């Protein structure tokens, strides 16, 4: 149903129905990306003086956009380029890469056959330049629009289980410190962001998708004022990693634990040592710089410089106000009419 009234007794039955993505549509999209990824690497540039080439194409974060309930989703597709001198190059040469990618993307639409409907958008308005392509399957009425975000390849060839070279983060921090603008290069580390949320248990990933939709429902109210969606995703992971650590758990317990953290934002300092740590002196100091920043501070596991949900303390206040309202909703309330309760952090 609406889910404002969806009780806490079941919860999952709502996630399994409305929230769960189409299995058939995903498979079609994943294949379409593989066609494009394999297309861009070969086609882009080539027969060209400049050694810069497309190394890989990775899908980034995605958020279901409410229309009926879930009718559509917006995702980010990061195109990695090589032979760039610095991280800043992806910002300056962005317009140069936007044209080369768009040129072959249109050519890919003509030459390559797809199962879904490949849609290359017209030049985008209300934005400085912008680009995107839409993948839709009218049979299932599923639609997704990918925003192409060109980025330098920092990791090069990287596989899960391997901690990235600390030297890479050193170059990132030194360049982010001098030129300013902390956390703009997070797109290069997208592989680590996906790998962070991919290996999570099924019940947790379903919980995250529940939190994802909660964010979108409030996003059509307060607008862009609220913090980035990535903050809520990492916060859900933190709620599970602390005190629970169970394969099977209650969604009502977790959803309650996440909402109470939104109100605790001023008390929240969170960071992950997954892809980096204090072994390197340069990385260590920069990591301590972020921890002493005004709360809430959620440190991007893939981006030691990048602070998710930071820079605005009134963003979380607007979020905490609506988080307080949803606490009064039956969503968190069980059969008794009382609260299900949060997770013990012991």
Resolution of this PDB entry, in A?
Answer: 3.1
295 backbone dihedrals φ, ψ, rounded to 5°: -75, 155
- The answer to the question of whether 312 is labelled as a binding residue is no
62 has binding-site annotation:
yes
Provide the residue ranges of all domains of the chain, joining segments of one domain with +: 1-160, 161-346
CATH 1.10.1410.20 fits 161-346, yes or no: yes
CA distance 48 to 103: 15
Q: Distance (Å, rounded) from C-alpha 8 to C-alpha 126?
A: 41
Angstrom distance (rounded) from CA 223 to CA 162: 39
Which CA distances in Å does 345 have to 9, 238, 241, 254?
22, 10, 9, 12
Q: Are strands 142-148 and 54-65 parallel, antiparallel or unpaired?
A: unpaired
248 annotated as ligand-binding: no
Give the residue from 299, 344, 325 showing the smallest Cα distance to 214: 325
Beta-strand pair 133-137/142-148:
antiparallel
Check whether 38 is labelled as a binding-site residue: no
Instruction: Calculate the CA dihedral of residues 341, 342, 343, 346 and round it to 10 degrees.
Output: -100
Task: Give the C-alpha separation, 215 to 316, whole Å.
Answer: 12
Question: Minimal CA–CA distance to 161: which of 201, 199, 200?
Answer: 199
C-alpha dihedral sign at 249, 322, 264, 302: positive
Cα 44 from Cα 97, distance rounded (Å): 9
Q: Residue 17: count other Cβ atoms within 10 Å of its Cβ.
A: 10
Would the annotation count 74 as a binding residue? Answer: yes
Is 209 part of any known ligand binding site?
yes
φ, ψ of residue 255 in degrees (nearest 5): -65, -30
Strand partners, 151: 80
Q: How many CB atoms lie within 10 A of CB 246?
A: 13
Give me the count of residues in the chain: 346
Closest CA to 97 of 123, 71, 79, 121: 79
Cα–Cα distance for residue pair 148/133, rounded to 1 Å: 8
User: What gap in Å lies between CA 130 and CA 181, rounded to an integer?
Assistant: 20
For domain 1-160, the CATH architecture is: 2-Layer Sandwich (3.30)
Structure-block tokens of residue 283: 């990385």
Q: Please give the structure tokens belonging to residue 144.
A: 């997704």
Question: Which residues have a Cβ under 8 Å from the Cβ of 179 and sit 6 or more positions away?
Answer: 88
Contact status, residue 270 vs residue 299, Cβ threshold 8 Å: yes
Q: Is 229 annotated as a binding residue?
A: yes
State the Cα–Cα distance between residues 150 and 141, nearest whole angstrom.
29
What's the Cα-to-Cα distance from 242 to each of 1, 120, 258, rounded to whole Å? 31, 44, 11
- 166-178 helix and 281-291 helix, angle to the nearest 10 degrees: 60
User: Are residues 338 and 278 in contact, defined by beta-carbon separation less than 8 angstroms?
Assistant: no
């Amino acid at each position: 149903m609406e889910l404002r009234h969806t009780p806490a007794r079941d919860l999952d039955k709502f996630i399994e129905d409305h929230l769960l993505p189409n299995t058939c549509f995903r498979t079609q999209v994943k294949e379409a990306i593989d066609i494009v990824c394999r297309f861009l690497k070969e086609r882009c540039f080539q027969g060209t003086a400049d050694p810069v080439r497309v190394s890989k194409v990775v899908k980034g974060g995605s958020s279901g956009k409410g229309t009926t309930l879930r009718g559509r989703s917006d995702a980010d597709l990061v195109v990695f380029l090589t032979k760039l001198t610095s991280f800043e190059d992806q910002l300056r040469r962005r317009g140069e890469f936007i044209q080369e990618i768009r040129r072959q993307l249109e050519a890919c639409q003509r030459e390559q056959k797809f199962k879904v409907t490949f849609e290359v958008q017209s030049p985008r308005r209300e934005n400085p330049r912008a680009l995107s392509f839409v993948l839709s399957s009218p049979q299932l009425q599923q639609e997704v629009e990918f925003d192409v975000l060109p980025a330098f390849d920092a990791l090069g060839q990287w596989t899960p289980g391997y901690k990235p070279n600390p030297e890479i983060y050193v170059q990132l921090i030194k360049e982010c410190k001098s030129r300013g603008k902390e956390g703009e290069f997070s797109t290069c580390f997208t592989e680590l962001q996906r790998d962070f949320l991919r290996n999570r248990p099924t019940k947790l990933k379903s919980l995250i998708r529940l939190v994802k939709h909660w964010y979108q429902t409030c996003k059509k109210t307060h607008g862009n004022k609220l913090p980035p969606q990535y903050a809520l995703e990492l916060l859900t992971v933190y709620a599970w990693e602390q005190g629970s650590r169970k394969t099977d758990f209650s969604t009502a317990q977790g959803f309650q634990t996440v909402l109470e953290l939104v109100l605790k934002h001023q008390k929240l300092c969170i960071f992950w040592e997954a892809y980096y740590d204090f072994t390197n002196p340069v990385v260590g100091r920069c990591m301590l710089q972020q921890l002493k920043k005004p709360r809430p501070v959620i440190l991007d596991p893939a981006d030691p410089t990048g602070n998710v949900g930071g820079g605005d303390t009134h963003s979380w206040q607007r979020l905490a106000q609506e988080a307080r309202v949803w606490l009064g909703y039956p969503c968190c309330k069980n059969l008794d009419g009382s609260l299900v309760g949060a997770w013990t952090m012991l």
